[PDB]
């Protein structure tokens, strides 16, 4: 990273960051098979299997009601997701997805809209119910001497119960993708199937947490014993393009006593989203992972190419650079990725110091740029900032 100090505007541009920008959404439809648990009955009273089977049936009914509510209610991210979900809810699409996964647990499906989604099947609970539990419950007796059966029921219905709980606690649209909606291996498989080049897929597989964080899930519905839902994952199609951070402080001069202060109002993150310069005002909109900067394409603001020139000549006429003016100098510290801007004016004693030897140097009045190699701490009166 290279941090350049602009004396004209008492600012800093830090450059060298490599971008990672979202360019779309990939839909992974999931079909979780529960089996014919609603044709099983335990009439022998309290048992572990009975409690587990009651939890399972109650969950299936709760998810049916939640889907009813969601569909009675649904009559940019969640907008597109709900659109593609209404597309999938068509009977043709549901049958086509359940047939595509007739002999495989993963397939590439194509909807009527041309949308290319990934269909996945979670068949563990159906397999347990049809190939084991149904034979164990003979003549409506579930207080059997096989405790491994109850343990297995718990193990194989944990995920179904968790999915139902998360979709019911959020009315059909979860804000986050849990490990029960989509595991880590399923997430990697979804990433590998995204419509983007190899480099983006490699970068995203190496940063799966960032992908999961920006994703959500939408319940499609309960079709028989099959709970169908969908996970929308971010597709980062633009990578390794320039990003830079601008940080500023009040630049004040004096003329015959009258002060003139200027402060850049364009501070924040900037990234070259493929021919469009995008500005993120709040630094919480971007996160730094090593050399890469993940910025949320939402909350971004397109700015003209000419705005960049504010870092070369703040007084340019080719663009109205965003600045604020004043006549009352304010002393301030603006920490930059590799240092700090220090505006020191009358009535303030500013200094730079170290963690081992203490104060290094009193700063002169004006705007100074301190590097994290020159000092470890900056001080304005009694306020102390620690540099990176």
């Amino acid at each position, epitope marked *: 990273l290279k941090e350049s100090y602009l004396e004209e505007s008492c600012s800093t541009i830090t450059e060298g960051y490599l971008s990672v920008l979202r360019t779309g959404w990939y839909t992974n439809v999931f079909t979780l098979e529960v089996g014919d648990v609603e044709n099983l009955t335990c009439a022998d009273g309290p048992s572990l299997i009975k409690t587990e089977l009651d939890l399972t049936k109650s969950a299936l009914r709760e998810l049916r009601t939640v889907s009813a509510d969601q569909l009675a209610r649904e009559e940019a991210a969640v907008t597109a997701g709900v659109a593609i979900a209404k597309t999938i809810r068509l009977e043709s699409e549901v049958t086509a997805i359940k047939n595509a996964l007739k002999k495989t647990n993963e397939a590439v499906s194509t909807l009527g809209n041309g949308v290319r989604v990934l269909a996945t099947a979670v068949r563990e609970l159906k397999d347990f119910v049809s190939k084991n539990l149904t034979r164990a419950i003979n003549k409506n007796k579930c207080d059997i001497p096989d405790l491994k059966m109850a343990v297995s029921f718990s193990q194989f219905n944990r995920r179904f119960l968790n999915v139902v709980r998360q979709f019911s606690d959020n009315a059909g649209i979860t804000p986050a993708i849990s490990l029960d909606l989509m595991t880590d291996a399923e997430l990697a498989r979804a990433v590998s199937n995204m419509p983007t080049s190899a480099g983006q897929i490699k970068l995203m597989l190496e940063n799966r947490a960032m992908v999961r964080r920006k994703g959500f899930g939408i319940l499609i519905g309960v079709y028989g014993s099959s709970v169908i839902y969908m996970v929308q994952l971010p597709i980062f199609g633009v990578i390794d393009t320039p990003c830079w951070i601008v940080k500023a402080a009040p630049s004040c001069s004096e003329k015959k006593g009258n002060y003139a*202060c200027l402060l850049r109002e364009d*501070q924040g993150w900037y990234c070259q989203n493929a021919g469009s310069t995008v500005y993120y*005002p709040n630094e919480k909109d971007c996160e730094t992972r090593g050399d890469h900067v993940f910025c949320d394409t939402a909350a971004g603001i397109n700015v003209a190419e000419q705005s960049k020139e504010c870092n070369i000549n703040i007084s340019t006429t080719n663009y109205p650079c965003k600045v*604020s003016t004043g006549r009352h100098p304010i002393s301030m510290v603006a920490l930059s990725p590799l240092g700090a801007l220090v505006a020191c004016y009358k009535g303030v004693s500013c200094s730079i110091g170290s963690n081992r030897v203490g104060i290094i140097k009193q700063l002169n009045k004006g705007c100074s740029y301190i590097t994290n190699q020159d000092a470890d701490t900056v001080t304005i009166d009694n306020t102390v900032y620690q540099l990176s």
Partner: nanobody
Framework: QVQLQESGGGSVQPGDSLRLSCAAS?????MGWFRQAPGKERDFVAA????????GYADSVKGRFSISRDNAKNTVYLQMNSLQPEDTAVYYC???????????????????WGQGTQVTVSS
């Protein structure tokens, strides 16, 4: 949060001038004026920040308008001279309870908003 009370609008003719006022129910740091015109989107007109004691205007308005503040009354005044048909809009007063710095030129950085005041230029 703070509630903002605006005033001063009107129906004025090309070339004439108006003055708008906006007072706050509490302490404000960044206080300014945006404007949304019929059919267009909300745009920045001018703001003052007290943390940095600085003032900014948009390019469309610089030279015509002027913004001033009374810190004791948490009040902000906006003089609007040489008003032309293209300044016809609903001007909203915006404010920020205070704290961290952030650009004045962007509405997302303001958390308090008024209902608006009409300014109509014609004939």
């Amino acid at each position: 949060q703070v509630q903002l009370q605006e005033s001063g609008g009107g129906s004025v003719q090309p070339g004439d001038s108006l003055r708008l006022s906006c007072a706050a129910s509490g302490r404000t740091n960044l206080m300014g004026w945006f404007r949304q015109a019929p059919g267009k989107e909300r745009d920045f007109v001018a703001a003052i920040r007290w943390s940095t004691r600085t003032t900014g205007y948009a390019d469309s308005v610089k030279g015509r308008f002027s913004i001033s503040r009374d810190n004791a009354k948490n009040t902000v005044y906006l003089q609007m001279n040489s008003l032309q048909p293209e300044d016809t809009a609903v001007y909203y007063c915006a404010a920020d309870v205070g704290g961290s710095y952030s650009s004045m030129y962007y509405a997302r950085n303001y958390d308090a908003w008024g209902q608006g005041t009409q300014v109509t230029v014609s004939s």
